[PDB]
């Protein structure tokens, strides 16, 4: 039975300002470097863990011992993404009736089916870059973001939010990222109900009408035509529940939809601004993925089977998430009195936080070389030992949309491997932002055509 550690505190307020800061989840991995796999963090009224090693994790993972808890961040997503698959706890009835839904739907079979719509999103990337003049450079968050984000719509429920055709965001798309700055936000707000706060809250409720107003529309256009489409809206108006027979009502699939918006924007374009980062700064690697782009993308337009031969444009992914996990952290609570590592007695209901980059430079898993970009790493899977690679969180509660997000991310990757020779034009010094995500902020590339027809 061991002391957990705990860092530095600030009196009444405990540890609470150590997170009063624009890069809080960069900021806990300098303390987990400092006190290792395991620290308390206290804040006026509450308690939670911070885990870091495989070692421990590999515990928390047990669902017969943990589950999901809501982070105080989720609670603050909850006001708009409702009881949706991402912010619901496991026992609300429409979490197993939604997830029973939806699973088929989010299969690796089931992305033959979205291929297409996603081919037509990466083709207007392409021809976008294409389309460059020669002094030009790319916003490369700020385009991948355009991607997921209109690849979602459309495989989602073939909505065109027409990124490529804008500077400023779609009307919704400026409501929910207010919506979710504004959750984010009030991590760190002390005092909330202070008068001050009248105009967030006038303006966070305007953005939530925003949304709905739009979805519940599109909800309503859909069953007001009986159209039936290769979409998720689709799957959700017709699907029952095998469990309880039922079919889930028109503002829980608001709520799916609006949860899934969330996921296919920076969060999934997150995931490829780091791959290009990463393989801009390792030419040897880049060189290696080319090569296989051009190899295996024989065809004008990437077939389903040819983004499944990408074998090392999926390590080069594997690779990004396990440096920079773009949802960075997830939230347990014990279900029953256990004793974690043999060390740490909880007590029914206490919390952890999970803290997936750090658990990724666990060097007992990974060797000493933890913060090198090396995809090899990824040649044989079977010898990663259980829970060591988390950055789809864990068990039924892990990400639904894992097997949309790598099939998107191969596909764009594949293609923009297969079209430009990439140059880091500024020697771009990574700067990672944090919102709902992590993002390489300012990463700017130049892309020279290799003038490939489409
Ligand atoms: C289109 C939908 C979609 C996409 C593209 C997507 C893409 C990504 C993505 C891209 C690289 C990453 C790193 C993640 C990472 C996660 N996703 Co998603 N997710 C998506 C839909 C979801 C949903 C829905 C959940 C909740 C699943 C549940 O609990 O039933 C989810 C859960 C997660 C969790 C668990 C959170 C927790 O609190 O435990 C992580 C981590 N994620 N996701
Ligand atoms: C919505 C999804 C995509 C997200 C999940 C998250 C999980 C953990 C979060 C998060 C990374 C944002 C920064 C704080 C952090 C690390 C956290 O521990 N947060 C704890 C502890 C905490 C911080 N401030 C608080 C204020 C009140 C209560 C708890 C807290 C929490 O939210 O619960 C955040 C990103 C957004």
């Known amino acids: ?3 957990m550690p705990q860092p530095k505190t600030f009196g009444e ?7 009063n800061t624009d890069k809080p989840v960069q900021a806990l991995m300098k303390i987990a470097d400092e006190l290792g796999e395991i620290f308390k963090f206290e804040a006026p009224g509450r308690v939670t863990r911070y885990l870091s090693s495989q070692r421990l994790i590999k515990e928390a ?18 006001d708009f993404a409702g009881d949706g698959l991402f912010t619901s706890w496991t026992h609300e009835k429409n979490w197993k009736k939604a997830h029973n839904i939806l699973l088929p739907s989010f299969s690796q079979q089931a992305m033959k089916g979205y291929h297409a719509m996603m081919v037509d999103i990466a083709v207007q990337l392409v021809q976008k870059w294409e389309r460059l003049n020669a002094d030009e450079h790319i916003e490369v968050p700020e385009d991948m973001t355009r991607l997921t984000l209109d690849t979602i719509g459309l495989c989602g429920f073939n909505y065109r939010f027409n990124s490529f055709y804008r500077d400023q965001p779609h009307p919704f798309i400026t409501s929910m990222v207010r919506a979710l700055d504004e959750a984010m936000n009030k991590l760190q707000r002390a005092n909330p109900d202070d008068p001050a706060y009248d105009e967030n809250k006038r303006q966070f409720q305007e953005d939530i009408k925003v949304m709905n107003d739009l979805v519940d529309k599109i909800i309503a256009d859909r069953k007001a035509s009986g159209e039936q489409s290769d979409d998720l809206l689709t799957h959700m108006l017709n699907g029952k529940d095998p469990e309880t027979g039922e079919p889930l009502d028109d503002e829980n699939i608001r709520y799916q939809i609006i949860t899934f918006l969330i996921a ?33 993308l024989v065809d ?16 080069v ?8 996990p773009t949802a960075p952290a ?73 097997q949309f997000a790598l099939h998107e991310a191969t596909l ?43």
């Open 1 to 3: 039975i061991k002391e």
């Open 13 to 19: 307020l405990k540890n609470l300002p150590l997170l």
């Open 61 to 78: 993972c047990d669902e017969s011992r943990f589950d999901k808890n809501l982070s105080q961040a989720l609670k603050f997503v909850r």
């Open 264 to 296: 296919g924007h920076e969060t999934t374009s997150g995931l490829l601004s780091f791959a290009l980062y990463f393989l801009v700064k390792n030419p040897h690697v880049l060189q290696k993925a080319a090569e296989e782009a051009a190899r295996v």
């Open 300 to 315: 004008p337009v990437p077939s389903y089977k040819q983004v499944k031969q990408l074998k090392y444009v999926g390590m």
């Open 317 to 324: 992914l594997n690779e990004a998430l396990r440096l920079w």
């Open 330 to 402: 997830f939230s347990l609570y014990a279900k029953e009195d256990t004793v974690l590592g043999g060390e740490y007695p909880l007590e029914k209901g206490d919390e952890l936080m999970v803290l997936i980059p750090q658990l990724h430079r666990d060097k007992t898993i990974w060797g000493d070389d933890v913060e090198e970009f090396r995809p090899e790493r990824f040649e044989n899977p079977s010898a990663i030992p259980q829970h060591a690679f988390k950055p789809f969180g864990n068990g039924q509660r892990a990400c639904i949309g894992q």
């Open 412 to 454: 764009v990757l594949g293609m923009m491997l297969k079209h430009f020779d990439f140059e880091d034009h500024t020697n771009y010094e990574l700067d990672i932002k944090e919102t709902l995500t992590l993002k390489p902020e300012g990463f700017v590339v130049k892309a020279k055509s290799k003038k490939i027809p489409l």
